[PDB]
Amino acid sequence: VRPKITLACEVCKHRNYITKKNRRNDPDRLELKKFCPNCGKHQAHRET
Amino acid sequence: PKAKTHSGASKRFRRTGTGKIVRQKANRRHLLEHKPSTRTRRLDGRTVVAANDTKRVTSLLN
Amino acid sequence: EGGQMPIHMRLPKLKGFRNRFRTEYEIVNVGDINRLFPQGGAVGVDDLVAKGAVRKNALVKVLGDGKLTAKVDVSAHKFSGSARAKITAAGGSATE
Amino acid sequence: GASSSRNGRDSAAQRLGVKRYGGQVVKAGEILVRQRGTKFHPGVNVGRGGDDTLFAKTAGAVEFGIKRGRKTVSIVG
RNA sequence: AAUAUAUAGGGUGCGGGAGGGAACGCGGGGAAGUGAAACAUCUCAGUACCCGUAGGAGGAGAAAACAAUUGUGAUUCCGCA
RNA sequence: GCCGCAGCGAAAGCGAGUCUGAAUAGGGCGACCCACACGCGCAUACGCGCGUGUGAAUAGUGGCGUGUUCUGGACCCGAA
RNA sequence: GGGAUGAGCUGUGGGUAGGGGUGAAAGGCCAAUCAAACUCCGUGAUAGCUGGUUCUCCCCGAAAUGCAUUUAGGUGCAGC
RNA sequence: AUGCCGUGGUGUAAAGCGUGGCAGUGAGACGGCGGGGGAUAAGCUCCGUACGUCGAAAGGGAAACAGCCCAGAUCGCCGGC
RNA sequence: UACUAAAAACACAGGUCCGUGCGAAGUCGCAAGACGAUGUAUACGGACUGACGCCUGCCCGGUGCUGGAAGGUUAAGAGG
RNA sequence: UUGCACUACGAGUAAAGAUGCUCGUUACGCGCGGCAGGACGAAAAGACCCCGGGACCUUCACUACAACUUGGUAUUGAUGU
RNA sequence: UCUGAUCGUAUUGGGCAUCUAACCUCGAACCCUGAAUCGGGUUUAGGGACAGUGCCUGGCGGGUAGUUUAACUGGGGCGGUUGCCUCCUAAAAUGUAACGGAGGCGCCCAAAGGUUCCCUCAACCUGGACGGCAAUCAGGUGGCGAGUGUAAAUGCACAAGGGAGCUUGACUGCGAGACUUACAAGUCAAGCAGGGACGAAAGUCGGGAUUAGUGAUCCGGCACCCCCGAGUGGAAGGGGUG
Ligand SMILES: *C(=O)[C@H](CCSC)NC=O
Ligand SMILES: [Mg+2]
Ligand SMILES: [Mg+2]
Ligand SMILES: [Mg+2]
Ligand SMILES: [Mg+2]
Ligand SMILES: [Mg+2]
Ligand SMILES: [Mg+2]
Ligand SMILES: [Mg+2]
Ligand SMILES: [Mg+2]
Ligand SMILES: [Mg+2]
Ligand SMILES: [Mg+2]
Ligand SMILES: [Mg+2]
Ligand SMILES: [Mg+2]
Ligand SMILES: [Mg+2]
Ligand SMILES: [Mg+2]
Ligand SMILES: [Mg+2]
Ligand SMILES: [Mg+2]
Ligand SMILES: [Mg+2]
Ligand SMILES: [Mg+2]
Ligand SMILES: [Mg+2]
Ligand SMILES: [Mg+2]
Ligand SMILES: [Mg+2]
Ligand SMILES: [Mg+2]
Ligand SMILES: [Mg+2]
Ligand SMILES: [Mg+2]
Ligand SMILES: [Mg+2]
Ligand SMILES: [Mg+2]
Ligand SMILES: [Mg+2]
Ligand SMILES: [Mg+2]
Ligand SMILES: [Mg+2]
Ligand SMILES: [Mg+2]
Ligand SMILES: [Mg+2]
Ligand SMILES: [Mg+2]
Ligand SMILES: [Mg+2]
Ligand SMILES: [Mg+2]
Ligand SMILES: [Mg+2]
Ligand SMILES: [Mg+2]
Ligand SMILES: [Mg+2]
Ligand SMILES: [Mg+2]
Ligand SMILES: [Mg+2]
Ligand SMILES: [Mg+2]
Ligand SMILES: [Mg+2]
Ligand SMILES: [Mg+2]
Ligand SMILES: [Mg+2]
Ligand SMILES: [Mg+2]
Ligand SMILES: [Mg+2]
Ligand SMILES: [Mg+2]
Ligand SMILES: [Mg+2]
Ligand SMILES: [Mg+2]
Ligand SMILES: [Mg+2]
Ligand SMILES: [Mg+2]
Ligand SMILES: [Mg+2]
Ligand SMILES: [Mg+2]
Ligand SMILES: [Mg+2]
Ligand SMILES: [Mg+2]
Ligand SMILES: [Mg+2]
Ligand SMILES: [Mg+2]
Ligand SMILES: [Mg+2]
Ligand SMILES: [Mg+2]
Ligand SMILES: [Mg+2]
Ligand SMILES: [Mg+2]
Ligand SMILES: [Mg+2]
Ligand SMILES: [Mg+2]
Ligand SMILES: [Mg+2]
Ligand SMILES: [Mg+2]
Ligand SMILES: [Mg+2]
Ligand SMILES: [Mg+2]
Ligand SMILES: [Mg+2]
Ligand SMILES: [Mg+2]
Ligand SMILES: [Mg+2]
Ligand SMILES: [Mg+2]
Ligand SMILES: [Mg+2]
Ligand SMILES: [Mg+2]
Ligand SMILES: [Mg+2]
Ligand SMILES: [Mg+2]
Ligand SMILES: [Mg+2]
Ligand SMILES: [Mg+2]
Ligand SMILES: [Zn+2]
Structure with a gap:
């Protein structure tokens, strides 16, 4: 019910981050601004 | 005959230029989600074998 | 260690591999060309062996530790970057 | 038994x-x-910490005192 | 011979084999106790034992060889690596 | 042939440095003599930088002896 | 004391061999030994277990606690 | 109250610390004091104590009496306290 | 039960069930071969009750045994 | 069988049941026939109990193998439908 | 020429039936054979591409074989327990045992995180339509008796408790110096740089008031980096980072 999701970038698609969400409270994939070390700046991040 | 070296401990320890015996650090292979980045950075790199272990570790490399 | 997981199984393996094709070079500094050859001249790979500065039948490589004041014309494999400077700063040369 | x-x-x-x-x-x-909690409070040149650890920020001597009931830990620089 | 071509089998005369030996050799069969602080993979160990078969020794051997851009040029054995 | 002669790094590789890193940021590992004269930016006298020494103390490796350890039955005796 | 014309007792000769024989069944018997015989070899089997370990003097001198353990009468590391 | 950490004086040879060689030990017992278990029973059991002794400590005293009190045997003496 | 147990234990004639159509089934053997048997289902082997008299009730869910093959799952080989 | 030997008893004390220690009490030295209370008497490195190892036995504990058995393929062919 | 049906020639595969020549017979006769219930050969009578065996493959398999079957324990068995977190025992630092006395944990939260600004509660007293001991309202008294996602302790009213706007630092590259410690581990960290969030600024932010919500190594899986690439160029595989 609390799986480990991974957060890939939206420009270079590198899987930079891993965290946990709830699956019944959040059926759709998270979107967060996080730092991308390849791009050198904050990009968007969805799940996979 | 001839003294065989321990094949396991020679894949885990090595020597520097002066004679210190370095090693890596545990707890950094899996189950890395709940470990914050202040912990996975403390376990990064190499450290010196402690002063109490360095007799048995030397005798397994020789 | 009495039963527990010992020091050579608690700890992870050292990372990486060992290169099968690594070519090692034997080391002479340019601060040893000064002390062994103060009159200068030709410094061959065979001349460094007989003076005891380097081993037999191996590839030499001149590095740049120390001062150089003599005027030497040294032939070697793979000169360093900072050793072509100190050799030509006295009037010599460096050929492969 | x-x-x-x-x-x-x-x-x-x-x-x-x-x-x-x-x-x-x-x-x-x-x-x-x-410590658990703030039994002692940060004063001058003392930070609290993540689990209320009360480290030091500047070298010097440690002196304890009172600041409106809550007792403090300070460092004379 | 049955059965015809013929063979199986029989008669006769020449040569040879069998068995033994302390170790060594080559081909084949092949444990366990033990070690793993238990044990099954693994070890012990292709060891003990066993079978075939030699020779004064044997096996191997005259490149479907290595090597890596120059090269070495049958095999066996010892020292290194 | 072995050990000493340069190290760092997973390795390519570079080398009194080197790996990590965007970093002329910081750390890890490794090198690196002021007890004195002099010149010099110049420190109150005291020292960073840099030349000649006053001529700083380095150093390994091969035998033999001894203690311990390793592979073997391994200090000796003893099963079911 | 039980059988004593019977599923009787007995002589001589022969057969069955070790995870096998034989058993009107008790794990009985198989050369004074049997819940897997004897002899030789692997073999100087292994034993965290018990026992033993030989001349002298001089100086210093503990521990029986902590941590971990298929660990609790063993052992590693720390303490001394 | 004690204990504990820091610092400034003073005192004390065989104290402390770093790094190597070689260890043994990891079954403790009783006594004083503070406690848990037990019936505030045990020569009971489990902990604390810069506490002691025995273990590894002879000599004197407690009739005898590892653990209590006094005292630490280098050797000699038909000397004193 | 030779060597502490002779019994109520084992055997037994009698009973039932299951196996076997004949170099049988079962057993000793890697095989050939043998016993079974110079026997042929009124015989032979396996299991359990144990002269004789009166009798032997109910349960096919569980685990076996025998027979069946509708559908489910399932190896190598073919296929590529 | 046996460490010794000019080997009493009571009430004590101690590894908690003393010929050997303490305080007492009793006993002339040595033999021969008897008795069996103690010498924790003699014999068997406790068979019970626990700890470590071993054996053999069981089963719907684990992993294997003999035997029995399935299908493919070789031995393995011809003509029909 | 394509979807679909049908027909024809050739090739090959599966069933069923027949055939004989491989193979099979402890059916018979004859011969080696003088003496033969063995054996082989010839002929005949039946079976027949089945069976048997070889290689591959699934099933069943205490019939047999090698071994495991935990420790703690006021003797063993039976019962109970084993790691992490909080209190007391615990003798006013730290630490401290027993099958001593009490309880919790193997999560939850996309806001219950970051920041900025504002607020003060429970209980009680008086008044009030349905309305009651206690819903909502108004006023007094009230300094913490409420509250904190979750156990207890230490905290917290200056709020870490109640409310709202914007957000993603629930970051990447690191880290002087310490706590704890046999070792392996665990804990805290000012500050520097990149790139951000809130705020007028100062500044605070590397998850949550704090301490549990976990698992060494080995062997594998995926994404990325393009480091080695067994003659060379690739590839296979290995390596690093997450
Ligand atoms: C139990 O007492 C007994 C032992 C023999 S007498 C000490 N067990 C079996 O015989
Ligand atoms: Mg939501
Ligand atoms: Mg990894
Ligand atoms: Mg991480
Ligand atoms: Mg374990
Ligand atoms: Mg936190
Ligand atoms: Mg011969
Ligand atoms: Mg074995
Ligand atoms: Mg074994
Ligand atoms: Mg073993
Ligand atoms: Mg052992
Ligand atoms: Mg020859
Ligand atoms: Mg290296
Ligand atoms: Mg540096
Ligand atoms: Mg000698
Ligand atoms: Mg009579
Ligand atoms: Mg009579
Ligand atoms: Mg009679
Ligand atoms: Mg019995
Ligand atoms: Mg006998
Ligand atoms: Mg046996
Ligand atoms: Mg052996
Ligand atoms: Mg032995
Ligand atoms: Mg002394
Ligand atoms: Mg030790
Ligand atoms: Mg112990
Ligand atoms: Mg102990
Ligand atoms: Mg104690
Ligand atoms: Mg006691
Ligand atoms: Mg005491
Ligand atoms: Mg007391
Ligand atoms: Mg006791
Ligand atoms: Mg003493
Ligand atoms: Mg002792
Ligand atoms: Mg004394
Ligand atoms: Mg005394
Ligand atoms: Mg006296
Ligand atoms: Mg006097
Ligand atoms: Mg008898
Ligand atoms: Mg009798
Ligand atoms: Mg019958
Ligand atoms: Mg049969
Ligand atoms: Mg019948
Ligand atoms: Mg039956
Ligand atoms: Mg009966
Ligand atoms: Mg049924
Ligand atoms: Mg007398
Ligand atoms: Mg008495
Ligand atoms: Mg007496
Ligand atoms: Mg006496
Ligand atoms: Mg007498
Ligand atoms: Mg008598
Ligand atoms: Mg008696
Ligand atoms: Mg006796
Ligand atoms: Mg005994
Ligand atoms: Mg069965
Ligand atoms: Mg078949
Ligand atoms: Mg077949
Ligand atoms: Mg078995
Ligand atoms: Mg036990
Ligand atoms: Mg008990
Ligand atoms: Mg606690
Ligand atoms: Mg305390
Ligand atoms: Mg205290
Ligand atoms: Mg619980
Ligand atoms: Mg908010
Ligand atoms: Mg708040
Ligand atoms: Mg996270
Ligand atoms: Mg650090
Ligand atoms: Mg910034
Ligand atoms: Mg702004
Ligand atoms: Mg910060
Ligand atoms: Mg919490
Ligand atoms: Mg492993
Ligand atoms: Mg290639
Ligand atoms: Mg790849
Ligand atoms: Mg990194
Ligand atoms: Zn990106």
């Missing part, structure tokens, strides 16, 4: 308490009072 091991368990002692006392020269970063 009545198996009255209904309660036979404990945690590990956490080594809390005051670690550098008064009039004692410290370095930058030395942990002064490790």
Whole structure:
């Protein structure tokens, strides 16, 4: 019910981050601004 | 005959230029989600074998 | 260690591999060309062996530790970057 | 025999308490009072910490005192 | 011979084999106790034992060889690596 | 042939440095003599930088002896 | 004391061999030994277990606690 | 109250610390004091104590009496306290 | 039960069930071969009750045994 | 069988049941026939109990193998439908 | 020429039936054979591409074989327990045992995180339509008796408790110096740089008031980096980072 999701970038698609969400409270994939070390700046991040 | 070296401990320890015996650090292979980045950075790199272990570790490399 | 997981199984393996094709070079500094050859001249790979500065039948490589004041014309494999400077700063040369 | 091991368990002692006392020269970063909560409060040149650890920010001598009821840990620089 | 071509089998005369030996050799069969602080993979160990079969020794051997851009040029054995 | 002669790094590789890193940021590992004269930016006298020494103390490796350890039955005796 | 014309007792000769024989069944018997015989070899089997370990003097001198353990009468590391 | 950490004086040879060689030990016992278990029973059991002794400590005293009190045997003496 | 147990234990004639159509089934053997048997279902082997008299009730869910093959799952080989 | 030997008893004390220690009490030295209370008498490195190892036995504990058995393929062919 | 049906020639595969020549017979006769219930050969009578065996493959398999079957324990068995977190025992630092006395944990939260600004509660007293001991309202008294996602302790009213706007630092590259410690581990960390969030600024932010919500190594899986690439160029595989 609390799986480990991974957060890939939206420009270079590198899987930079891993965290946990709830699956019944959040059926759709998270979107967060996080730092991308390849791009050198904050990009968007969805799940996979 | 001839003294065989321990094949396991020679894949885990090595020597520097002066004679210190370095090693890596545990707890950094899996189950890395709940470990914050202040912990996975403390376990990064190499450290010196402690002063109490360095007799048995030397005798397994020789 | 009495039963527990010992020091050579608690700890992870050292990372990486060992290169099968690594070519090692034997080391002479340019601060040893000064002390062994103060009159200068030709410094061959065979001349460094007989003076005891380097081993037999191996590839030499001149590095740049120390001062150089003599005027030497040294032939070697793979000169360093900072050793072509100190050799030509006295009037010599460096050929492969 | 009545198996009255209904309660036979404990945690590990956490080594809390005051670690550098008064009039004692410290370095930058030395942990002064490790504790649960703010039994002691940060004063001058003392930061709190993530689990209320009360380290040091500047070398000097440690002195304790009172600041409106809440007792403080300070460092004379 | 049955059965015809013929063979199986029989008669006669020449040569040879069998068995033994302390170790060594080559081909084949092949444990366990033990070690793993238990044990099954693995070890012990292709060891003990066993079978075939030699020779004064045997086996191997005259490149479907290595090597890596120059090269070495049958095999066996010892020292290194 | 072995050991000493340069190290760092997973390795390519570079080398009194080197790996990590965007970093002329910081750390890890490794090198690196002020007890004195002099010149010099110049420190109150005291020292960073840099030349000649006053001529700083380095150093390994092969035998033999001894203590311990390793592979073997391994200090000796003893099963079912 | 039980059988004593019977599923009787007995002589001589022969057969069955070790995870096998034989058993009107007790794990009985198989050369004074049997819940897997004897002899030789692997073999100087292994034993965290018990026992033993030989001349002298001089100086210093403990521990029986902590941590972990298929660990609790063993052992590693720390303390001394 | 004690104990504990820091610092400034003073005192004390065989104290402390770093790094190597070689260990043994990891079954403790009783006594004083503070406690848990037990019936505030045990020569009972489990902990604390810069507490002691035995273990590894002879000599004197407690009739005898590892653990209590006094005292620490280098050797000699038909000397004193 | 040779060597502490002779019994109520084992055997037994009698009973039932299951196996076997004949170099049988079962057993000793890697095989050939043998016993079974110079026997042929009124015989032979396996299991359990144990002269004789009166009798032997109910349960096919569980695990076996025998027979069946509708559908489910399932190896190598073919296929590529 | 046996460490010794000019080997009493009571009430004690001690590894908690003393010929050997303490305080007492009793006993002339040595033999021969008897008795069996103690010498924790003699014999068997406790068979019970626990700890470590071993054996053999069981089963719907684990992993294997003999035997029995399935299908493919070789031995393995021809003509029909 | 394509979807679909049908027909024809050739090739090959599966069933069923027949055939004989491989193979099979402890059916018979004859011969080696003088003496033969063995054996082989010839002929005949039946079976027949089945059976048997070889290689591959699934099933069943105490019939047999090698071994495991935990420790703690006021003797063993039976019962109970084993790791992490909080209290007391615990003798006013730290630490401290027993099958001593009490309880919790193997999570939950996309806001219950970051920041900025504002607020003060429970209980009680008086008044009030349905309305009651206690819903909502108004006023007094009230300094913490309420509250904190979750156990207890230490905290917290200056709020870490109640409310709202914007957000993603629930970051990447690191880290002087310390706590704890046999070792392996565990804990805290000012500050520097990149790139951000809130705020007028100062500044605070590397998850949550704090301490549990976990698992060494080995062997594998995926994404990325393009480091080695067994003659060379690739590839296979290995390596690093997450
Ligand atoms: C139990 O007492 C007994 C032992 C023999 S007498 C000490 N067990 C079996 O015989
Ligand atoms: Mg939501
Ligand atoms: Mg990894
Ligand atoms: Mg991480
Ligand atoms: Mg374990
Ligand atoms: Mg606690
Ligand atoms: Mg936190
Ligand atoms: Mg011969
Ligand atoms: Mg074995
Ligand atoms: Mg074995
Ligand atoms: Mg073993
Ligand atoms: Mg052993
Ligand atoms: Mg020859
Ligand atoms: Mg290296
Ligand atoms: Mg550096
Ligand atoms: Mg010698
Ligand atoms: Mg009579
Ligand atoms: Mg009579
Ligand atoms: Mg009679
Ligand atoms: Mg019996
Ligand atoms: Mg006998
Ligand atoms: Mg046996
Ligand atoms: Mg052997
Ligand atoms: Mg032995
Ligand atoms: Mg002394
Ligand atoms: Mg030790
Ligand atoms: Mg112990
Ligand atoms: Mg102990
Ligand atoms: Mg004790
Ligand atoms: Mg006691
Ligand atoms: Mg005491
Ligand atoms: Mg007391
Ligand atoms: Mg006791
Ligand atoms: Mg003493
Ligand atoms: Mg002792
Ligand atoms: Mg004494
Ligand atoms: Mg005395
Ligand atoms: Mg006396
Ligand atoms: Mg006097
Ligand atoms: Mg008898
Ligand atoms: Mg009798
Ligand atoms: Mg019958
Ligand atoms: Mg048969
Ligand atoms: Mg019948
Ligand atoms: Mg039956
Ligand atoms: Mg009966
Ligand atoms: Mg049925
Ligand atoms: Mg007398
Ligand atoms: Mg007496
Ligand atoms: Mg007496
Ligand atoms: Mg006497
Ligand atoms: Mg007499
Ligand atoms: Mg008598
Ligand atoms: Mg008696
Ligand atoms: Mg006796
Ligand atoms: Mg005994
Ligand atoms: Mg069965
Ligand atoms: Mg078949
Ligand atoms: Mg077949
Ligand atoms: Mg078995
Ligand atoms: Mg036990
Ligand atoms: Mg008990
Ligand atoms: Mg305390
Ligand atoms: Mg205290
Ligand atoms: Mg519980
Ligand atoms: Mg908010
Ligand atoms: Mg709040
Ligand atoms: Mg996270
Ligand atoms: Mg650090
Ligand atoms: Mg910034
Ligand atoms: Mg702004
Ligand atoms: Mg910060
Ligand atoms: Mg929490
Ligand atoms: Mg492993
Ligand atoms: Mg290639
Ligand atoms: Mg790849
Ligand atoms: Mg990194
Ligand atoms: Zn990106």
